[PDB]
Design an enzyme around this catalytic site. Structure first.
Site, PDB file in Angstrom:
ATOM      1  N   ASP A 252       0.822  -1.203   0.000  1.00 16.02           N
ATOM      2  CA  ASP A 252       0.000   0.000   0.000  1.00 16.02           C
ATOM      3  C   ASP A 252       0.860   1.259   0.000  1.00 16.02           C
ATOM      4  O   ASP A 252       1.239   1.790   1.065  1.00 16.02           O
ATOM      5  CB  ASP A 252      -0.909  -0.011   1.218  1.00 16.02           C
ATOM      6  N   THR A 253       1.162   1.725  -1.217  1.00 19.05           N
ATOM      7  CA  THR A 253       1.908   2.962  -1.417  1.00 19.05           C
ATOM      8  C   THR A 253       1.193   4.209  -0.936  1.00 19.05           C
ATOM      9  O   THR A 253       1.855   5.225  -0.712  1.00 19.05           O
ATOM     10  CB  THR A 253       2.291   3.187  -2.894  1.00 19.05           C
ATOM     11  N   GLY A 254      -0.132   4.149  -0.808  1.00 19.20           N
ATOM     12  CA  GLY A 254      -0.907   5.231  -0.214  1.00 19.20           C
ATOM     13  C   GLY A 254      -1.001   5.264   1.314  1.00 19.20           C
ATOM     14  O   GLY A 254      -1.612   6.175   1.894  1.00 19.20           O
TER      15      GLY A 254
END
Ligand SMILES: CC(C)(C)NC(=O)[C@@H]1C[C@@H]2CCCC[C@@H]2CN1C[C@@H](O)[C@H](Cc1ccccc1)NC(=O)[C@H](CC(N)=O)NC(=O)c1ccc2ccccc2n1
Lengths: 99, 99
Positions: free
Chosen positions: A25-27
């Protein structure tokens, strides 16, 4: 490896020697885990995203292995529907976004 | 580009003729923008995040340019602190995760 985004990028992690499925999860600034009863001291924390804030327990310097790549840092535990691997650990495994 | 993750993967996008900053988010199934006007019909929808569910406006077949790459797809508009580019659009620009 290379992880495609056609489906949720779920991968196996090991934490506490338990194997779990978790979302790369880059967010997410943080690593947030489904409720589990980890030993050790923790600090209360509130974290936010879409829909509002939840209360979590912050555990520090926890080893987390992600598809065989070892990491260690802060994990937040509480009532999330999904285990999420956030940037604090994705950086440690040399993860990039590419296009 | 190749984007590392020691900071938030925020990029400039163009949507509806306007520039915005948005987050490249492998954890998000959908693309969710802060409240704004877009052309065309929308339909009420609900979506869920770490903090619970929100009401959003769903706009279909909206062009979005992401670092010069073209996508055209579903954009959800609602109460958010951040403009989030989700996998529905990330996949259109050929985005993968690598480590
Ligand atoms: C965006 C949709 C709704 C399509 N998807 C998500 O929110 C998904 C939902 C799944 C299932 C529930 C648990 C969360 C996962 C993954 N999220 C995606 C995340 O990447 C999400 C994206 C986001 C970023 C910023 C605001 C709102 C959504 N990130 C987070 O929920 C995390 C949690 C965390 N603290 O690590 N958040 C943030 O990184 C964050 C950064 C800045 C910021 C500023 C103001 C308010 C909130 C806030 N949250």
């Amino acid at each position: 490896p290379q992880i495609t985004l056609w489906k949720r990028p779920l991968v196996t992690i090991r934490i506490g020697g338990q194997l779990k499925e978790a979302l790369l999860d880059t967010g997410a600034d943080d690593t947030v885990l489904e409720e589990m009863n980890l030993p050790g001291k923790w600090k209360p924390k509130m974290i936010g995203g879409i829909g509002g804030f939840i209360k979590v327990r912050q555990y520090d310097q926890i080893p987390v292995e992600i598809c065989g790549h070892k990491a260690i840092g802060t994990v937040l535990v509480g009532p999330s529907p999904v285990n999420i691997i956030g940037r604090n650990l994705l950086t440690q495994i040399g993860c990039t976004l590419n296009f």
